[PDB]
Every structure is written in C-alpha cells, then in structure tokens.
Amino acid sequence: SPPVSRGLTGGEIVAVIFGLLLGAALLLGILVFRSRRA
Amino acid sequence: SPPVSRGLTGGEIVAVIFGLLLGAALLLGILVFRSRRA
C-alpha cells in the first residue's frame, strides 16, 4: 500500500468505495421500489 | 475528467467503475440466489 506513483493510491481506494457503496446502495433501493416497497 | 490533479485521476475513474461494477453485479446475484432463481 504505497503512497503514490504505484498501482495503489488514496484516490483509488476512495474511488472504489464510492462506486461500490453508491452503486450497491442505489441498486438495492430501486429494486425495493420496483415492486416490493415494504 | 482531467488526466491528473483536479481531484480526478485515471486510477480514480477505474477504481469507481471497479467497485461499482462488481458491487451491483455481485449484489444482484446474491439477491437472485437468495430464493428466487427464476
């Protein structure tokens, strides 16, 4: 887990969690509103 | 979506899509594997 200039950087981590969280989160929501908003 | 700096970098983009793609993808799967594989 290097600082920078490598295949791993702070922006890379925060980026993955950003799309992974908002991605799955929003996905679940829409799925619930689809036809099971209980 | 600049090449560097500006709080936006190549690694940041690929990172978001990485967790976003695998995030929702894996999510939807488990949802169908739970008890509704139709």
From Swiss-Prot, chains A, B:
Organism: Homo sapiens (Human)
Sequence intervals crossing the membrane: 13-33
PTM summary: Phosphorylated. Autophosphorylation is stimulated by its ligand EFNA1. Ubiquitinated.
UniProt protein name: Ephrin type-A receptor 1
Tissue localization of expression: Overexpressed in several carcinomas.
Localization annotation: Cell membrane
Disulfide bonds listed in the record: none
Domain of life where this protein originates: Eukaryota
Subunit details: Homodimer. Forms a signaling complex with LCK; PTK2B/PYK2 and PI3-kinase upon activation by EFNA1; regulates T-lymphocytes migration. Interacts (via SAM domain) with ILK (via ANK repeats); stimulated by EFNA1 but independent of the kinase activity of EPHA1. Interacts (kinase activity-dependent) with PTK2/FAK1.
Record family assignment: Belongs to the protein kinase superfamily. Tyr protein kinase family. Ephrin receptor subfamily.
Function statement: Receptor tyrosine kinase which binds promiscuously membrane-bound ephrin-A family ligands residing on adjacent cells, leading to contact-dependent bidirectional signaling into neighboring cells. The signaling pathway downstream of the receptor is referred to as forward signaling while the signaling pathway downstream of the ephrin ligand is referred to as reverse signaling. Binds with a low affinity EFNA3 and EFNA4 and with a high affinity to EFNA1 which most probably constitutes its cognate/functional ligand.
